[PDB]
Design a protein around this ligand. Structure first.
Ligand code: MG
Ligand code: MG
Ligand code: MG
Ligand code: MG
Ligand code: MG
Ligand code: MG
Ligand code: MG
Ligand code: MG
Ligand code: MG
Ligand code: MG
Ligand code: MG
Ligand code: MG
Ligand code: MG
Ligand code: MG
Ligand code: MG
Ligand code: MG
Ligand code: MG
Ligand code: MG
Ligand code: MG
Ligand code: MG
Ligand code: MG
Ligand code: MG
Ligand code: MG
Ligand code: MG
Ligand code: MG
Ligand code: MG
Ligand code: MG
Ligand code: MG
Ligand code: MG
Ligand code: MG
Ligand code: MG
Ligand code: MG
Ligand code: MG
Ligand code: MG
Ligand code: MG
Ligand code: MG
Ligand code: MG
Ligand code: MG
Ligand code: MG
Ligand code: MG
Ligand code: MG
Ligand code: MG
Ligand code: MG
Ligand code: MG
Ligand code: MG
Ligand code: MG
Ligand code: MG
Ligand code: MG
Ligand code: MG
Ligand code: MG
Ligand code: MG
Ligand code: MG
Ligand code: MG
Ligand code: MG
Ligand code: MG
Ligand code: MG
Ligand code: MG
Ligand code: MG
Ligand code: MG
Ligand code: MG
Ligand code: MG
Ligand code: MG
Ligand code: MG
Ligand code: MG
Ligand code: MG
Ligand code: MG
Ligand code: MG
Ligand code: MG
Ligand code: MG
Ligand code: MG
Ligand code: MG
Ligand code: MG
Ligand code: MG
Ligand code: MG
Ligand code: MG
Ligand code: MG
Ligand code: MG
Ligand code: MG
Ligand code: MG
Ligand code: MG
Ligand code: MG
Ligand code: MG
Ligand code: MG
Ligand code: MG
Ligand code: MG
Ligand code: MG
Ligand code: MG
Ligand code: MG
Ligand code: MG
Ligand code: MG
Ligand code: MG
Ligand code: MG
Ligand code: MG
Ligand code: MG
Ligand code: MG
Ligand code: MG
Ligand code: MG
Ligand code: MG
Ligand code: MG
Ligand code: MG
Ligand code: MG
Ligand code: MG
Ligand code: MG
Ligand code: MG
Ligand code: MG
Ligand code: MG
Ligand code: MG
Ligand code: MG
Ligand code: MG
Ligand code: MG
Ligand code: MG
Ligand code: MG
Ligand code: MG
Ligand code: MG
Ligand code: MG
Ligand code: MG
Ligand code: MG
Ligand code: MG
Ligand code: MG
Ligand code: MG
Ligand code: MG
Ligand code: MG
Ligand code: MG
Ligand code: MG
Ligand code: MG
Ligand code: MG
Ligand code: MG
Ligand code: MG
Ligand code: MG
Ligand code: MG
Ligand code: MG
Ligand code: MG
Ligand code: MG
Ligand code: MG
Ligand code: MG
Ligand code: MG
Ligand code: MG
Ligand code: MG
Ligand code: MG
Ligand code: MG
Ligand code: MG
Ligand code: MG
Ligand code: MG
Ligand code: MG
Ligand code: MG
Ligand code: MG
Ligand code: MG
Ligand code: MG
Ligand code: MG
Ligand code: MG
Ligand code: MG
Ligand code: MG
Ligand code: MG
Ligand code: MG
Ligand code: MG
Ligand code: MG
Ligand code: MG
Ligand code: MG
Ligand code: MG
Ligand code: MG
Ligand code: MG
Ligand code: MG
Ligand code: MG
Ligand code: MG
Ligand code: MG
Ligand code: MG
Ligand code: MG
Ligand code: MG
Ligand code: MG
Ligand code: MG
Ligand code: MG
Ligand code: MG
Ligand code: MG
Ligand code: MG
Ligand code: MG
Ligand code: MG
Ligand code: MG
Ligand code: MG
Ligand code: MG
Ligand code: MG
Ligand code: MG
Ligand code: MG
Ligand code: MG
Ligand code: MG
Ligand code: MG
Ligand code: MG
Ligand code: MG
Ligand code: MG
Ligand code: MG
Ligand code: ZN
Lengths: 83, 208, 99, 99
RNA sequence: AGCCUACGGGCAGGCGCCGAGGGUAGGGCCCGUGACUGGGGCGAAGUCGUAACAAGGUAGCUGUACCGGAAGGUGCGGCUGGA
RNA sequence: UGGAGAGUUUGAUCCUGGCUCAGGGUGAACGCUGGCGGCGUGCCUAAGACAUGCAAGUCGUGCGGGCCGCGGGGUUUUACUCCGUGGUCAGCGGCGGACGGGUGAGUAACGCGUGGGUGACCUACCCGGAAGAGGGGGACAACCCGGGGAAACUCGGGCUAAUCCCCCAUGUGGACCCGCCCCUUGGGGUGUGUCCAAAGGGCUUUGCCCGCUUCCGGAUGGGCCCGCGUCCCAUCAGCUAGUUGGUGGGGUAAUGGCCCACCAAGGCGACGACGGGUAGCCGGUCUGAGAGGAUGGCCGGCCACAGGGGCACUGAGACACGGGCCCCACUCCUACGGGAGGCAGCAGUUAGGAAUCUUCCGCAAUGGGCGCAAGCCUGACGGAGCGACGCCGCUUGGAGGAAGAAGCCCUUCGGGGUGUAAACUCCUGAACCCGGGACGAAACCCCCGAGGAGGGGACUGACGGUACCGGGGUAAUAGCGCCGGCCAACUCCGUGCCAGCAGCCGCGGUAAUACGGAGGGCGCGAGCGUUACCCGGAUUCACUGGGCGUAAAGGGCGUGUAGGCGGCCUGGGGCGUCCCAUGUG
């Protein structure tokens, strides 16, 4: 299926991640459908996370099982939250 | 590495008092006042008509030697000077002057740009409170070049301040000997520096 | 959109097929001067309608055969043998080469 | 050294046979139909055709013959069965055909 | 003739088409090599002459032809880059 | 935001003209030397052959069984078996093994790139909409028995389970023939006829969950098709029988000469066909003022292949690297009947070469497979190891110190140089020691609420006792190229067309700043030089931006084919050309 997950960037020991939608079979750092938001795993700045919640709701709408620790970053941005 | 070898031999090459010593360079010699001629057994014979190369070459020899810097780091800056949109000639110098090992000299905590590097690499310095031992550190505007806390009480540090008392300092700089700190105010304009080098030749030489 | 272009029919021999010659102008990518080149496509003519000397529009279409991947969209005019002249004489000259 | 991919190989062999069996009976049945379809018969030329049209889609359930490839078989079957009867006959017994 | 069958059929097997490649025959291109032979280049001093640069001591050059140890000579035209 | 030139044909001069050098670059290698770190990077050759270890499995919540361990009995008691549960081993069955990882052989091609086409197509798993699951029957492994075999494995005989195979029904629907309308390539709807569905399992069981069947849509991933772009030789000029098209068929998910029968005589080519040589292509990369040239390593996308070659099976998907069958080559086993194997996966070995790494640590993180979950596997990955291979940062000290040590070198014997250099005094404190010591890691999971949205709580770190912090603390590696001109840094001696230098011009034939050593000097500095190759200079293939009276260069002269080019006025179209917008890049 199409999945929403993370992709490594930034040097060795200095990880970053692009939360992105790609085909499950793709390579990790490989070409992807669309970048939604980044995420610093160490918070070296105030901007240690971000999510284009507009389209994120979209892919879940068109079905797109995301990772576990990918869903996590989505709960913090609370794409699922509604009240 | 720096010119760890004899220093006063360099001044004797451009027939110019290159200030790179300290107390002595203001004595009766940067080694100069007794030997206004090049080293080696020769030299003090009838000098040779310098070629366009000879000149433009040695002009660059001064500017670098002045900051006791390596050819590597040196040309990297000149090239970088070429990248940013502005008068490369002068721009270079400003970047060249934003060196931490040089700012500490301009702030006068150190007798020479060499002593300045040692003090810096030894961490005796600090920017905006945080410590720094990288003499290449690009000093930003508004940065506070302060002497490290446990460093203040040192004798050598004091003596260089006992000389920076009252006596003015760079117009793009502010001393504050009381707090034993300092301040990088703004990137110098061409005139604010008085280097014995015509920066235009140094550009020319960088074309081969 | 299905690509389309016009050209002169210059072969009626085949059954339910015709040959269209199409020119295109474009500048030399180093020498500017606009230059012309040409190509022949195999058009599908199921009604055996279009004849020699016809200027016609053809359209990128479902593969009819090995070389046929176009269909004759519509006619443009009949009298155009003048072009068929230049094409044939071009083929005439090849004789005066190989030894 | 011995990956248990054998489980996959032994399985395919069983698979191969089933498909081989379902598929072959498809062919031999269809032949009976076309033979009788031309042979003027129809009281059963169509009766046979049913077991065919059936066995096709039934095989279609399984991973055997699948997709519209199940349809082709049916089309290229009864489409020809009907015509073979057009050699004098008229839609007799209620075959899978609508008049 | 064997096997399975809910007997309507299936599998096994047999034959045919095509088929990796193997074999035979004759062609094409390319590379290496070959007694010997043809000219070419290079050379600090060789043998023979002295054709060219001065009217080069028969003005030169040239296409062709014939001839001569060798440069070359001569015939027929041509050129001036000769007079 | 960019553009420099020099030496060399002469007695000298101008010009043409070739050679040559300074620059930048590299997956480099070689020599001499070599201290610390960080991020990168490392078989370009034989797509040669490989020991060993690991690199793809997973679900007991699909099914029965061997084994071992725990607890109990159905029985008033008992053979023992029934029953509950954990583990293990295979088997049956499901999902994945077509992703991931490696290599450039092949390929001059719709292979790649770029923009489009499909009314000519498929899409496992995920997401949305609708409907449905009634009854009945069967086989084969495991296991039991007997046989053959060295082994690998194998034959026969008998039981049996299921989400395995099968028949009948229900047909929301879908498939097919034919007919009708819409639309218009095979798109949508409708009618009669016929054809096809389903599987159970688990718990807290009157209900929720994971599944199962049919159909439409979505998302994603593809197949095929087309315009245009993509190397050298024309001393390769003609090429073509499935060849070009047609009718009907076979095959596929699907078009097509893909494949076949029949018919027609076509198709391609100087706008370079056919042939030969070479090559994976691109984003990009190196150089250049740019236009241009050169290139495709690491990284991402696409293609191709898995010792050579062919083939199909299974499957949503493959002609499948760690699946299958066959031939050839090679390796090993053998009881000579027969049999096993495939590193261009991670390490490592051997061969070749000028040359290219540890048989390391770990699933903690990210990512992938299976599963309800717990969790299991993962040489993808996350790290560490080795090599100045590259880029970057850093150190071998800082201040003071003679009208100037000794030594060595030169000398007009007065002196000059090395040289503030050292010695010396002072200061700082790489290394080494002491203590503390992570970020990377909050989610699956647990309770409240409903297993949802929302909240709260807990476990988990290979690197690593690492980075970084605080404390204490020793002045503690410098080397290489050059010094006639270009090109810049000079003297002494030895040598004597010998020894040797050399990129060009040239140097040496007893007075060499050109050979070798020394003193001194210049340029770089943990590097410096050399070889190779690319761009530059080269404006020396010149579009930007060159020339042809004598320097190389006008065809011996005509006629003319294609092509190239084309006068003055008006009008239509709007291809080139120009502008805007938008998609794409
Ligand atoms: Mg040094
Ligand atoms: Mg500006
Ligand atoms: Mg065809
Ligand atoms: Mg056709
Ligand atoms: Mg010929
Ligand atoms: Mg079959
Ligand atoms: Mg039969
Ligand atoms: Mg048969
Ligand atoms: Mg019909
Ligand atoms: Mg058979
Ligand atoms: Mg035959
Ligand atoms: Mg054959
Ligand atoms: Mg053959
Ligand atoms: Mg054979
Ligand atoms: Mg043989
Ligand atoms: Mg032969
Ligand atoms: Mg020969
Ligand atoms: Mg020969
Ligand atoms: Mg001769
Ligand atoms: Mg020759
Ligand atoms: Mg001689
Ligand atoms: Mg001679
Ligand atoms: Mg003569
Ligand atoms: Mg003479
Ligand atoms: Mg005469
Ligand atoms: Mg004469
Ligand atoms: Mg004469
Ligand atoms: Mg003459
Ligand atoms: Mg001549
Ligand atoms: Mg002559
Ligand atoms: Mg004659
Ligand atoms: Mg004449
Ligand atoms: Mg005359
Ligand atoms: Mg005359
Ligand atoms: Mg005369
Ligand atoms: Mg006269
Ligand atoms: Mg700029
Ligand atoms: Mg230049
Ligand atoms: Mg010359
Ligand atoms: Mg010369
Ligand atoms: Mg000359
Ligand atoms: Mg001369
Ligand atoms: Mg020149
Ligand atoms: Mg240069
Ligand atoms: Mg090397
Ligand atoms: Mg070596
Ligand atoms: Mg060497
Ligand atoms: Mg070495
Ligand atoms: Mg060494
Ligand atoms: Mg080192
Ligand atoms: Mg570092
Ligand atoms: Mg590290
Ligand atoms: Mg190998
Ligand atoms: Mg091992
Ligand atoms: Mg069990
Ligand atoms: Mg369990
Ligand atoms: Mg389940
Ligand atoms: Mg059991
Ligand atoms: Mg058990
Ligand atoms: Mg046990
Ligand atoms: Mg019991
Ligand atoms: Mg039990
Ligand atoms: Mg497998
Ligand atoms: Mg497989
Ligand atoms: Mg695949
Ligand atoms: Mg070719
Ligand atoms: Mg294309
Ligand atoms: Mg593309
Ligand atoms: Mg898959
Ligand atoms: Mg599933
Ligand atoms: Mg899915
Ligand atoms: Mg789904
Ligand atoms: Mg829903
Ligand atoms: Mg049943
Ligand atoms: Mg029965
Ligand atoms: Mg039963
Ligand atoms: Mg036995
Ligand atoms: Mg036995
Ligand atoms: Mg045996
Ligand atoms: Mg049995
Ligand atoms: Mg049996
Ligand atoms: Mg009913
Ligand atoms: Mg039904
Ligand atoms: Mg119905
Ligand atoms: Mg209905
Ligand atoms: Mg009608
Ligand atoms: Mg409709
Ligand atoms: Mg039914
Ligand atoms: Mg059922
Ligand atoms: Mg089933
Ligand atoms: Mg149930
Ligand atoms: Mg769809
Ligand atoms: Mg979609
Ligand atoms: Mg498509
Ligand atoms: Mg093209
Ligand atoms: Mg050519
Ligand atoms: Mg011929
Ligand atoms: Mg021929
Ligand atoms: Mg045929
Ligand atoms: Mg057809
Ligand atoms: Mg064909
Ligand atoms: Mg056809
Ligand atoms: Mg045929
Ligand atoms: Mg041709
Ligand atoms: Mg060609
Ligand atoms: Mg050509
Ligand atoms: Mg060739
Ligand atoms: Mg190749
Ligand atoms: Mg420009
Ligand atoms: Mg280019
Ligand atoms: Mg590689
Ligand atoms: Mg990289
Ligand atoms: Mg690559
Ligand atoms: Mg192959
Ligand atoms: Mg192979
Ligand atoms: Mg599958
Ligand atoms: Mg299949
Ligand atoms: Mg398929
Ligand atoms: Mg393959
Ligand atoms: Mg393949
Ligand atoms: Mg495979
Ligand atoms: Mg295979
Ligand atoms: Mg392999
Ligand atoms: Mg393998
Ligand atoms: Mg062998
Ligand atoms: Mg054996
Ligand atoms: Mg085996
Ligand atoms: Mg390996
Ligand atoms: Mg070796
Ligand atoms: Mg472990
Ligand atoms: Mg993991
Ligand atoms: Mg993890
Ligand atoms: Mg893994
Ligand atoms: Mg390491
Ligand atoms: Mg290492
Ligand atoms: Mg090295
Ligand atoms: Mg460095
Ligand atoms: Mg010192
Ligand atoms: Mg003195
Ligand atoms: Mg002395
Ligand atoms: Mg000494
Ligand atoms: Mg001297
Ligand atoms: Mg002297
Ligand atoms: Mg000192
Ligand atoms: Mg010294
Ligand atoms: Mg003391
Ligand atoms: Mg301290
Ligand atoms: Mg502790
Ligand atoms: Mg943590
Ligand atoms: Mg934490
Ligand atoms: Mg988390
Ligand atoms: Mg609860
Ligand atoms: Mg809260
Ligand atoms: Mg916790
Ligand atoms: Mg806690
Ligand atoms: Mg820890
Ligand atoms: Mg760890
Ligand atoms: Mg410390
Ligand atoms: Mg202390
Ligand atoms: Mg200390
Ligand atoms: Mg020391
Ligand atoms: Mg050192
Ligand atoms: Mg060095
Ligand atoms: Mg050098
Ligand atoms: Mg020298
Ligand atoms: Mg002497
Ligand atoms: Mg000497
Ligand atoms: Mg001496
Ligand atoms: Mg000699
Ligand atoms: Mg030398
Ligand atoms: Mg001489
Ligand atoms: Mg001498
Ligand atoms: Mg030299
Ligand atoms: Mg010596
Ligand atoms: Mg020296
Ligand atoms: Mg250096
Ligand atoms: Mg070098
Ligand atoms: Mg070279
Ligand atoms: Mg070049
Ligand atoms: Mg030229
Ligand atoms: Mg050239
Ligand atoms: Mg020539
Ligand atoms: Mg001439
Ligand atoms: Mg003429
Ligand atoms: Mg002419
Ligand atoms: Mg002629
Ligand atoms: Mg007009
Ligand atoms: Mg345009
Ligand atoms: Mg646009
Ligand atoms: Zn001085």
């Amino acid at each position: 299926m199409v999945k929403i997950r993370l992709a490594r960037f930034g040097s060795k020991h200095n990880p970053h991640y692009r939360i992105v939608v790609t085909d499950a079979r793709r390579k990790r750092d490989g070409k992807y459908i669309e970048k939604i938001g980044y995420y610093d795993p160490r918070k070296t700045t105030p901007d240690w996370l971000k999510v284009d919640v507009e389209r994120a709701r979209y892919w879940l709408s068109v079905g797109a099982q995301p990772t576990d620790t990918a869903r996590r970053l989505l709960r913090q941005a609370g794409v699922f939250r509604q009240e | 590495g720096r010119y760890i070898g004899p220093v006063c031999r360099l001044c004797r090459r451009e027939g110019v008092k290159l200030y790179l010593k300290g107390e002595r360079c203001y004595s009766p010699k940067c080694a100069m006042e007794r030997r206004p001629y090049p080293p080696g057994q020769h030299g003090q014979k009838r000098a040779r008509r310098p070629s366009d190369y000879a000149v433009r070459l040695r002009e660059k020899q001064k500017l670098r030697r002045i900051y006791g810097i390596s050819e590597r780091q040196f040309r990297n800056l000149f090239e970088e000077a070429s990248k940013k949109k502005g008068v490369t000639g002068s721009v270079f110098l400003g970047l060249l002057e934003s060196r931490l090992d040089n700012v500490v000299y301009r702030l006068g905590f150190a007798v020479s740009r060499r002593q300045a590097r040692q003090l810096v690499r030894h961490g005796h310095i600090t920017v905006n409170g945080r410590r720094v031992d990288l003499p290449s550190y690009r000093v930003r505007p508004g940065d506070e070049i302060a002497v490290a806390e446990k460093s203040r009480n040192l004798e050598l540090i004091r003596q260089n301040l006992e000389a920076m008392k009252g006596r003015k300092v760079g117009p793009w700089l502010s001393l504050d000997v009381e707090g034993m700190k300092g301040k990088f105010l703004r990137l110098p304009d061409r005139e604010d520096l008085a280097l014995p080098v015509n920066e235009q030749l140094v550009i020319e030489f960088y074309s081969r | 959109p299905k690509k389309v272009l016009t050209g002169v029919v210059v072969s009626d021999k085949m059954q339910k097929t015709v040959t269209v010659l199409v020119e295109r102008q474009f500048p030399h990518p180093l020498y500017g001067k606009v230059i012309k080149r040409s190509k022949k496509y195999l058009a599908h003519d199921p009604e055996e309608k279009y004849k020699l000397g016809d200027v016609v529009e053809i359209i990128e279409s479902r593969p009819i055969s090995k070389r046929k991947r176009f269909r004759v969209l519509r006619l443009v005019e009949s009298g155009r043998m003048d072009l068929v002249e230049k094409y044939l004489i071009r083929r005439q000259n090849y004789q005066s080469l190989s030894k | 050294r011995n990956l248990s991919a054998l489980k996959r190989h032994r399985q395919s062999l069983k698979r191969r046979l089933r498909n081989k069996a379902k598929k072959s009976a498809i062919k031999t049945l269809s032949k009976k139909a076309v033979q009788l379809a031309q042979e003027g018969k129809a009281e059963e030329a169509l009766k046979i055709m049913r077991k065919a049209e059936s066995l096709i889609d039934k095989a279609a359930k399984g991973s055997t013959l699948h997709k519209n490839a199940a349809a082709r078989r049916k089309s290229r079957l009864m489409r020809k069965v009907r015509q073979l009867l057009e050699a004098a006959g008229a839609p007799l017994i209620g075959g899978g055909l609508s008049a």
